[PDB]
Structures are given as C-alpha cells and as structure tokens.
Ligand binder design. Sequence first.
Ligand SMILES: [Zn+2]
Ligand SMILES: [Zn+2]
Ligand SMILES: [Zn+2]
Length: 70
Amino acid sequence: GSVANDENCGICRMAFNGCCPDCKVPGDDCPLVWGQCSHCFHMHCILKWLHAQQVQQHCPMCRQEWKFKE
Ligand SMILES: [Zn+2]
Ligand SMILES: [Zn+2]
Ligand SMILES: [Zn+2]
C-alpha cells in the first residue's frame, strides 16, 4: 503493498533501473523518458502509448498536455 513508490512505472510497473518488459535488451540503448513532472516512463513504452493512440494525448496520468521532458 500500500506504499506510495514512484520508482515504478505505471504502464508496466517496472523499476526505472531495469529493462523494458517486452524488451530483452541487456542495457545499452533502452533508457527511460521523463515528463513535465516527476512522471517518469520508459520511452518506448510511453512513446507507444501516445504514438499508438491519437485520440487522447493528455498524459496517461496527469491531465496536463503530455510533455516529452528531458
Ligand atoms: Zn527497451
Ligand atoms: Zn506527467
Ligand atoms: Zn512504461
């Protein structure tokens, strides 16, 4: 669990210090992407979330215009 840990994604609830679920990559070019806010999701993941669904663009969590923050 009931703890509030933001160290885990929301789409695949994985540790930012790990490799994507659908990606068996060792750890070379598979980092993560952050948003306007603490929001931190895996590039490929999030990217696909918005790159697959054009209907809604608003962040998958906040109602703010999804921003590909650095
Ligand atoms: Zn990956
Ligand atoms: Zn966000
Ligand atoms: Zn993800």
